[PDB]
Amino acid sequence: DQKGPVFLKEPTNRIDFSNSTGAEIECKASGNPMPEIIWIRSDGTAVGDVPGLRQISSDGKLVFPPFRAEDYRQEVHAQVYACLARNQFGSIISRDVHVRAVVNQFYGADILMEYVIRGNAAVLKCSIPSFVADFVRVESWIDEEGTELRPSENYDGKYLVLPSGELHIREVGPEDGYKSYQCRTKHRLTGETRLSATKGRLVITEPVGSKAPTFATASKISSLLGSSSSDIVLLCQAQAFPVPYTRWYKFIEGTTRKQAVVLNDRVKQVSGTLIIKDAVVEDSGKYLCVVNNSVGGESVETVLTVTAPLSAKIDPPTQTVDFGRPAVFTCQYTGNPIKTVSWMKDGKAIGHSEPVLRIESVKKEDKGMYQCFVRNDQESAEASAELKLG
Amino acid sequence: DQKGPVFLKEPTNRIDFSNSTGAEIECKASGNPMPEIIWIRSDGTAVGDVPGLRQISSDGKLVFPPFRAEDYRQEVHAQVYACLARNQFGSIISRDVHVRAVVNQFYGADILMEYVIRGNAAVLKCSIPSFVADFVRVESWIDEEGTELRPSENYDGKYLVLPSGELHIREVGPEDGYKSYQCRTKHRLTGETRLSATKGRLVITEPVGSKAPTFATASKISSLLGSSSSDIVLLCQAQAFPVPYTRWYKFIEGTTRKQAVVLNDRVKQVSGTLIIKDAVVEDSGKYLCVVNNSVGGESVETVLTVTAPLSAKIDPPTQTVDFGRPAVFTCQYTGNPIKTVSWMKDGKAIGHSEPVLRIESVKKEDKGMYQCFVRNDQESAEASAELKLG
Numbered sequence A, B: 001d002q003k004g005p006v007f008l009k010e011p012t013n014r015i016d017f018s019n020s021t022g023a024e025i026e027c028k029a030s031g032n033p034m035p036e037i038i039w040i041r042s043d044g045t046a047v048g049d050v051p052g053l054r055q056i057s058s059d060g061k062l063v064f065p066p067f068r069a070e071d072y073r074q075e076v077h078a079q080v081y082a083c084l085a086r087n088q089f090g091s092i093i094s095r096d097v098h099v100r101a102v103v104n105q106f107y108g109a110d111i112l113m114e115y116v117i118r119g120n121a122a123v124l125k126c127s128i129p130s131f132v133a134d135f136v137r138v139e140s141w142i143d144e145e146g147t148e149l150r151p152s153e154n155y156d157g158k159y160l161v162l163p164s165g166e167l168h169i170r171e172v173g174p175e176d177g178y179k180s181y182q183c184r185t186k187h188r189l190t191g192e193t194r195l196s197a198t199k200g201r202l203v204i205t206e207p208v209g210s211k212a213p214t215f216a217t218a219s220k221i222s223s224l225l226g227s228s229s230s231d232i233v234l235l236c237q238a239q240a241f242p243v244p245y246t247r248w249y250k251f252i253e254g255t256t257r258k259q260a261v262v263l264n265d266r267v268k269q270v271s272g273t274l275i276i277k278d279a280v281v282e283d284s285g286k287y288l289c290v291v292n293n294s295v296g297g298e299s300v301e302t303v304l305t306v307t308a309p310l311s312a313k314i315d316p317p318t319q320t321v322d323f324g325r326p327a328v329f330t331c332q333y334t335g336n337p338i339k340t341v342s343w344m345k346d347g348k349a350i351g352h353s354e355p356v357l358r359i360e361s362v363k364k365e366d367k368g369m370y371q372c373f374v375r376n377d378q379e380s381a382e383a384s385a386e387l388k389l390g
């Protein structure tokens, strides 16, 4: 009984931790005999062991012990890694691992106050530096009365914290001018929380005369995105008079035409704003916010991409073909979107972009492991297969 | 010598004025006999006199005298008008005249604090409510020190103001975090000037460790509009460490292919910000802002549409065709963009949308005026033509 190696435990394609947190990653594979594990930089070069920063356990595991703020080296803490299992029969490398370590430092948050018409919906977002935006999210909003607000179901009450962390207020009025809100932020890696410094207030203006609807950007296009099985937000910010009614439509694929969105238990609209409770890849497409009014109307396009995890499967996982015959391999994948598709043999980065691999004629040199690679900007996945000779 | 009606002086499409200013619009026409001029709603009814708010001068001129806010009336000041010149042979309308009177009313502004890392450029936008965006723009920027700044030519040195009104700063450092800036907004109709209450200041983050590039939006697409001969701003908000090199590209029309942008005296790139002086229709197209560095890169694409003044020409201006013979009118227009091209006869909407219309068989009933209507989401224009029977 003998066969090549196969990846069982693959490190997460993206890993985030602080300097004080440290990290451990383990790629675990099985094969007969036991394959040897190695780590490599994105360019394929074998990793060196760096004292105090990056070191191989030799157990098939790798670690980044905690380190001083000054001990940070880019080539280590910010890099794309991967795991390589190899033996007599062949070799395979694990899906790309993004290692990102953030040395702990304090940040700040500001809230831009938005002028709003009486009766129209209003929203206050907590502005954050784009660089740490990955690692931090808004935990809650707190009123000057001391009461705090958190995201949830039940979109009633006029006060709701959306999944984006943006505080939404429907049907505003002068009564809402007194109170002022500030947002709480929670850093994922640290777990520490910080409350907004600047106190966001909402200034309402009593409209005089009729005025057509207006968007706060004037750009007719935006590109949204989101993970499947999560609350999604398609926002429309338009202040206008008198008191617009809003309608959202979905374009049919590659069509100038469109059909109206179905408002139901799952898909909900809050006064300007669509929400998808649990998203699926089918919801992806071009969206349109149509906001009308007595005087006139205005429109905004929104591009939505629903993300799904990537996973690959090669078929058959193994086979044996006689000399002078066609070899066949079929890569079956799941997840969306998908941009890159490629192949390789014991590494070597061979092939082209097709879901299928074929060798017109078997040859002695074609034995060993084969691997299918599919991935997008944000993710990656792989599957392994062996080829015996007959 | 008999002639059909023709326009000499035609009103401008867009007319905005303050309640305290008041305005007068004029329509002039020619042809023998001299046409009968009538001011009418977009809807075909004769405009009647209203006391003090709206008055028709005996010379064929419409006027809207000043008034107090309490005397504001929607059906007059918010109404869309048109001029109808008429003769025995037929009649023609003018370009759509949008009358909008703004009852003098207050606005405000707030400056979001721009979070930045050392060495990277900074951009302070003066935020303005969506409704007054068209009536208000930023004239100048005043610092904490009280020094004043304007959107001068010679893009160089540290501080710069862009034509779009954003305050730009390069090579930011801790020394520049102490200062606090205030924009200056000027209402175009009244000429009133407001100095922002909120004082924008920059939070400077000492770089610690390497950080992949990040955009302040996370949107991959915007869309910008600007007139020809005016300076346009394509801007990249990406923050990255080590300080990234940025480059702009322009997609080929309808292709995934791309080409680099030509830099010159006219087109000058400031940091991540691309500027196009004296824009022309040829500049319209999709653009791509690319930002890279030792860690990686990220990009966003921007759709640009350059407007051009709409003007229409009909050929032949006049003709005569016998019964049974075909009639032909070619409307050749100017400007950009182009949404619809329509046709009317004697002030009646008919037919289809084409640059050309032909009557396969002429009839006595086809005697009359024909006009070509071109439009976009912003502007409109008209052209007139005579048709006589042989």
Ligand SMILES: *[C@@H]1O[C@H](CO)[C@@H](O[C@@H]2O[C@H](CO)[C@@H](O[C@@H]3O[C@H](CO[C@H]4O[C@H](CO)[C@@H](O)[C@H](O)[C@@H]4O)[C@@H](O)[C@H](O[C@H]4O[C@H](CO)[C@@H](O)[C@H](O)[C@@H]4O)[C@@H]3O)[C@H](O)[C@H]2NC(C)=O)[C@H](O)[C@H]1NC(C)=O
Pocket (backbone or CB within 6 Å): A256, A290, A291, A292, A293, A296, A297, A298, A299, B338, B339, B340, B341, B342, B343, B349, B352, B353
């Ligand atoms: C709520 O608010 C919305 C948005 O303001 C309003 O919907 C808009 O209404 C306008 C006016 O009808 C629409 O503009 C129209 O677009 C049509 C579609 O364009 C196609 O065809 C042209 C060629 O003609 C192509 O260039 C283009 O790429 C498209 O393929 C045009 O055909 C229309 O022209 C017609 O209208 C006039 C009458 O006004 C006729 O006289 C012309 O001859 C011609 O038949 C027109 O330009 C706009 O597209 C609408 N929005 C959207 C998103 O589609 C609602 O009306 C409003 N509802 C209220 C107030 O109740």
Ligand SMILES: *[C@@H]1O[C@H](CO)[C@@H](O[C@@H]2O[C@H](CO)[C@@H](O[C@@H]3O[C@H](CO[C@H]4O[C@H](CO)[C@@H](O)[C@H](O)[C@@H]4O)[C@@H](O)[C@H](O[C@H]4O[C@H](CO)[C@@H](O)[C@H](O)[C@@H]4O)[C@@H]3O)[C@H](O)[C@H]2NC(C)=O)[C@H](O)[C@H]1NC(C)=O
Pocket (backbone or CB within 6 Å): B019, B020, B021, B066, B067, B068, B069, B103, B104, B105
């Ligand atoms: C269009 O609508 C607007 C309001 O929506 C009107 O604007 C108001 O006009 C009235 C006069 O008709 C103003 O009332 C007086 O204002 C004086 C101060 O003026 C300052 O503000 C203007 C801008 O508004 C500046 O340009 C100017 O330089 C000044 O800084 C006060 O001194 C007056 O007080 C005196 O008069 C009142 C009676 O009116 C007495 O009772 C007092 O005791 C005192 O003696 C007075 O308050 C008003 O300020 C204007 N407000 C705004 C917001 O504009 C326009 O007049 C209207 N257009 C018309 C009618 O054509």
Ligand SMILES: *[C@@H]1O[C@H](CO)[C@@H](O[C@@H]2O[C@H](CO)[C@@H](O[C@@H]3O[C@H](CO[C@H]4O[C@H](CO)[C@@H](O)[C@H](O)[C@@H]4O)[C@@H](O)[C@H](O[C@H]4O[C@H](CO)[C@@H](O)[C@H](O)[C@@H]4O)[C@@H]3O)[C@H](O)[C@H]2NC(C)=O)[C@H](O)[C@H]1NC(C)=O
Pocket (backbone or CB within 6 Å): A338, A339, A340, A341, A342, A343, A349, A353, B256, B288, B290, B291, B292, B296, B297, B298, B299
């Ligand atoms: C500066 O930084 C920018 C990022 O802002 C870089 O720009 C992007 O670079 C990435 C690569 O890092 C490019 O992504 C590549 O796209 C190729 C083209 O995609 C087409 O083909 C796929 C099918 O595979 C279609 O789905 C798609 O619609 C396109 O039609 C892909 O083919 C590439 O995948 C390949 O790369 C790997 C190696 O990493 C191979 O092993 C694979 O087998 C495959 O051959 C890749 O994913 C992206 O297109 C770039 N965008 C732009 C706008 O440039 C710059 O490259 C960077 N500049 C410098 C100098 O560093």
Ligand SMILES: *[C@@H]1O[C@H](CO)[C@@H](O[C@@H]2O[C@H](CO)[C@@H](O[C@@H]3O[C@H](CO)[C@@H](O)[C@H](O)[C@@H]3O)[C@H](O)[C@H]2NC(C)=O)[C@H](O)[C@H]1NC(C)=O
Pocket (backbone or CB within 6 Å): A019, A020, A066, A067, A068, A069, A103, A104, A105, A106
């Ligand atoms: C990860 O990097 C951060 C940033 O350099 C380190 O944060 C700082 O670590 C020091 C360690 O002594 C903390 O000590 C503090 O010193 C200041 C005076 O400078 C004093 O006012 C405090 O009361 C405290 O004694 C400091 O608070 C801390 N700063 C932060 C977290 O913002 C961190 O130490 C690094 N991780 C490890 C494991 O070293």
